[PDB]
Design a protein around this ligand. Structure first.
Ligand SMILES: [Ca+2]
Length: 309
């Protein structure tokens, strides 16, 4: 009657992982036979490694691990393997070799490349519809880009493929600046503030961000410089960001489906905790032990299908 599942979130105050954490908790409360043991790893992998030892000591039947460091997947797998405990890794993708080293290791995530392509499609759509955004009238987008953590799968794929998609759409681009703000609102506000105080400031046409939290910090810096007409694009469709698309402060974002990634992680973890096949009685398509949940483009034209206009 007491199926214990251990869950580690790499950082509880990452805005998107906060939506994922609350949706997994919602699913756990709704299943009468489950007890979720939730942990905040506080963005430190040593803290997470010790939390996994305490969870195994408490006799959890499955682990749902959102890694701090993707390279620590091996360390986690060996802790789990000794007790025959299945591990459903989520959000930060481990290596293929790491996933292949243990029959009971699974992954729930997304195809990183896809959100980059979708963001580039949105920017392309809106660029063509608002020729007044081309401030210097040269037919090229002069942009700045706010990147997430360097090395991170989603940060590298969204930076590469948003520009790639724009160029493939026949829109030439010129990068005025790019720097990491580590997925953080405050750090993004400061970097955008620096750029608006630098020599490139009058040349900026579009602000591209790897997530909505950083986009929200850029919107604040633009407000302060009375540059609120510069379009900002993000990724995740956070409720607060959807409010800005609704108000026109952001020009578009890409839904990162937190509720279905949460549901897939919970479903796979509970099945595997019960000795059943990972996808039993579900509609999740597992391919090579991986579930990928689609991104969806969001702007003012389909915004009612995600929030109230
Ligand atoms: Ca231009």
């Amino acid at each position: 009657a007491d199926t214990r599942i251990g869950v580690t979130i790499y950082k509880y105050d990452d805005n998107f992982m906060s939506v994922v954490r609350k949706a997994i908790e919602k699913d756990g409360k709704s299943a009468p036979d489950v007890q979720l043991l939730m942990n905040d790893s506080q963005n430190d992998q040593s803290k997470q490694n010790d939390q996994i030892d305490v969870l195994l000591a408490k006799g959890v039947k499955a682990l749902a691990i959102n890694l701090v460091d993707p390279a620590a997947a091996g360390t986690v797998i060996e802790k789990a393997r000794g007790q025959n405990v299945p591990v459903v890794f989520f959000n930060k993708e481990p290596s293929r070799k790491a996933l292949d080293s243990y029959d009971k290791a699974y992954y729930v995530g997304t195809d990183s490349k896809e959100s980059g392509v979708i963001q580039g499609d949105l920017i392309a759509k809106h660029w063509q519809a608002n020729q007044g955004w081309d401030l210097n009238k040269d037919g090229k987008i002069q942009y700045v880009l706010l990147k997430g953590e360097p090395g991170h799968p989603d940060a590298e794929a969204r930076t590469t493929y948003v520009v790639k998609e724009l160029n493939d759409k026949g829109i030439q681009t010129e990068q005025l600046a790019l720097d990491t703000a580590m997925w953080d609102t405050a750090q993004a506000k400061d970097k955008m503030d620096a750029w608006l105080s630098g020599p490139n400031a009058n040349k900026i046409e579009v602000v591209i961000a790897n997530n909505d939290a950083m986009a929200m910090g850029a919107v604040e810096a633009l407000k302060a410089h009375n540059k609120s007409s510069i379009p900002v694009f993000g990724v995740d469709a956070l409720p607060e960001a959807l409010a800005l698309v609704k108000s026109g402060a952001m020009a578009g974002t890409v839904l990162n489906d937190a509720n279905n990634q949460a549901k897939a992680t919970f479903d796979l973890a509970k099945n595997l905790a019960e000795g059943k096949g990972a996808a039993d009685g579900t509609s999740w398509k597992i391919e090579n032990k991986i579930v990928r949940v689609p991104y969806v483009g969001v702007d003012k034209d389909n915004l009612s299908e995600f929030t109230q206009k």
